[PDB]
Amino acid sequence: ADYSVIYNFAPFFAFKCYGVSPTKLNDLCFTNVYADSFVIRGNEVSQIAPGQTGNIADYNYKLPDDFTGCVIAWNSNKLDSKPSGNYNYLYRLFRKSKLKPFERDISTEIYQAGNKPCNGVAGPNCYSPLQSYGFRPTYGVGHQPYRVVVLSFELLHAPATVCGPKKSTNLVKNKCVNFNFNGLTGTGVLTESNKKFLPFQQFGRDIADTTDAVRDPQTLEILDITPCSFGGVSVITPGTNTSNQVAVLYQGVNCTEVNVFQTRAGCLIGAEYVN
Amino acid sequence: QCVNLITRTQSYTNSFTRGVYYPDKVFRSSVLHSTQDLFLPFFSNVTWFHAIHVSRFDNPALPFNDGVYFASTEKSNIIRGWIFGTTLDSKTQSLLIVNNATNVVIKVCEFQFCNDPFLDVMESEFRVYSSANNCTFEYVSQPFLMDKNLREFVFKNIDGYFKIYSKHTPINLERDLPQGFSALEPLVDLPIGINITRFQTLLALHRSYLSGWTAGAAAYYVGYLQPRTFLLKYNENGTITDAVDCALDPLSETKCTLKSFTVEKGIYQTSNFRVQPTESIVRFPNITNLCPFHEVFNATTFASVYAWNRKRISNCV
Amino acid sequence: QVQLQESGGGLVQAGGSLRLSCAASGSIFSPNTMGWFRQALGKQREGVAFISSIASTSYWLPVKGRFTITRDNTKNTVHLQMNSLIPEDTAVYYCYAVDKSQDYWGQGTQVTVSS
Ligand SMILES: *[C@@H]1O[C@H](CO)[C@@H](O)[C@H](O)[C@H]1NC(C)=O
Ligand SMILES: *[C@@H]1O[C@H](CO)[C@@H](O)[C@H](O)[C@H]1NC(C)=O
Secondary structure, eight states: OOHHHHHTSSOOSEEEEESSOSGGGTTOOBSEEEEEEEEEEGGGSTTSSTTOOSHIIIIIOOOOTTOOEEEEEEEOHHHHOOTTOBTTOEEEOOOSSOOOTTOOOOOOOOEEOSSSOOTTBOOTTEEOSEEEOOBOTTSOTTTSEEEEEEEEEEOOSSOOOBOOOOOOOOOOOSSOEEEEETTEEEEEEEEEOOOOOOTTOOEEEOTTSOEEEEEOSSSOOEEEEEOOOOOOEEEEOOOTTTOOOOEEEEETOOGGGOOEEEOSSEEEESOOOOO | OOOOOEEEEEEEEEOTTOOOBOOSSEEOOSEEEEEEEEEOOTTOEEEEEEEEEOOOOBOOOEEOTTOEEEEEOSOTTTOOEEEEESSOSTTSOEEEEEEOSSOEEEEEEEEEEOSSOOEEOOOBOTTTEEEEEEEEEEEEEOOSOOOOEEEEEEEEEETTEEEEEEEEEEOOSSOSSOSSOOOBEEEEEEOOOOOOOEEEEOOEEOBOOOOOBOOEEEEEEEEEOEEEEEEEEEOTTSOEEEEEETTSSHHHHHHHHHTSSOOOSSOOOOOOOOOOOOOOOOOOOSOOOOOOHHHHHTOSOOOOGGGOOOOOOOSOO | OOEEEEEOOEEEOTTOOEEEEEEEESOOOSSOOEEEEEEETTSOEEEEEEEOTTSOEEBSSSOBTTEEEEEETTTTEEEEEEOSOOGGGOEEEEEEEOOSSSOEEOOOBOEEEOO
16 A cells, blocks of 8 residues: 555645554555545535534545544546536435445435425425535635545454555675564674575574574575674783783684684784794 | 256275475475474375266265365366355355466355356356355466376465465376375465355366266365374475374374484383363252342442441352 | 446427437446436536336436336346427436446437427
8 A cells, every 4th residue: 555656646635634643654554445535515525524514424424433544635626627517426415314434325215304205206395315516617615626535444353464565775785784574673694595495485494493594575585694793802911010901802703803813712902922 | 057966975095194284484404393283194084085977966065174185186177176165155255266277266255156066168157156246355376287196285274364285296006195205385375364164176077068067087085184293304405305293103202202203222201191081070059049139239228438338148049 | 337328319399209228338236226317408407317226216306207217127228218298308318327336427318309
């Protein structure tokens, strides 16, 4: 779900999000999304909101009080206005009972506002529930047509599968860097690997249950992960009363990864080798 | 046009060393990994089904239980589809898997499956189900039935995720469940998230065009999976070359304990034997008189908090 | 994509008869309701009459006898029968297919009467 194209589509009269901040939509993954598109007058844009009342809210489109999602509205004068009148847009003006949240009504039965039955034929005290939205280019900003899309994000017991794009960044190697691969976070050096992964397998583990090989998602390559060098620092020194000179031994560390001498114990700095 | 056509006979045979698959997506080399998962035990009851159509209802739906292992030595054209669900009607969501030469289509819809569904060869799916509504999944990909050769599949449904593993092993004159080992690679992973309790195997029938369907015989094998602990030996190239069932025989139990395929001479301690209870009994008092909780809980007036009222309750149920 | 075929319009003298026809091909999902609208010359658009999928009819003008709606279940088409034609119904007509999700519209038929 790329919300970036939604943001940059066009200037929007309203981009109001209930229950979720607009910035966190990309980084949050929802189970399902529902896009509800319709066209209403500019005055009725505010009626598409939880806890609101009106003709559109009661009889056309109702949102729950605990609705999680966003409502986006934008002007569509060039598309939904004609000099003769665009009568192709209709709204429900009369209904027996208020619409439940996320409910639609397509019945065209004549509204019965009187004791006498309407008998299915329009007449006195009987009115058509559906009225035409006579949009015109010269109408005031309150009455100009507006396209409204409501995004409803729902989470269920099923695993979530809808969210924003995953950044690729770049690939670096031969350096102790912080790596994040498909939620596997750590630090290491991603050198070349002679191992051959099976297409299904993404990770690789040592005998002692630790990750040692990984597969790159962007390009199907195998990288050997080696932890960054670490060791113990030991200080070689005579008595302080004798002198104040010291030498430092990095245990088990190659001398090129830190009066320098290389020994089997580690790298020695500050001491001179003699025969 | 649901027509009952197939008569089914059953025989019993040994599963031998089949029913293995890759349990996860982690590469391993030259190791011995022990995992608890739903598997088909070694040397178990496998049931051989022989379905015959000759040019009444005799194909009851086999329950899914904890999973299904399907095997077939027939060619890819004869066996074509699988039908999964709970009630196999339009009321509940259903899985239909159909395979042809070109590709394979897996569709999750509320199919109204027939009592004797089959694919009649163009190819017509209407014989399989009368109708399909409220459909929510379509998936098309490369077929997994390519052309003497055993084809093995295993189907699992865990936490709303449905898993299909498959493998093709050439088989000689030996019994269609031969010796040796063959790991089942994972093929299809689907987030369906519905309930499945019964399954049925589709059969391809060719119109006679002369008894409108040509007579045919199909032989397949059904095994069931249960929670077992298996020790698998990943090789140098991450291939499961061998495995042991941790609860088959005491020698396998020692192999499981020592995490090795070879056991030196000696006496090893493996587990503790204990005898399980047979049935449960409950002994309670003889009194039958109820107790007046209503008196406390519908009294008109209570006292103040500093003068709270207490009542002792005893000798009731 | 839905195509609503409109046919049966033209010039008819006073008191004549004709048969408008709308055939809905395309999506036209199962719980459909079909209707007819009227567009007088340079005026608003009112609803001629609506027929539902359960044969229930709701005429939105005191016009019974004038329009009669016939349903063709085999092809899911709707026919409007016009009789006793009088000059005040001279208007173009569009048929309205609500479907279930996205409603559609016709192309237009010229219905004219004068003497
Ligand atoms: C397999 O099961 C059947 C019935 O379920 C039983 O009669 C048979 O003895 C079983 N086979 C073995 C080898 O136990
Ligand atoms: C009733 O229960 C009492 C003890 O609660 C016991 O003495 C008596 O035997 C019981 N009566 C019967 C018929 O079991």
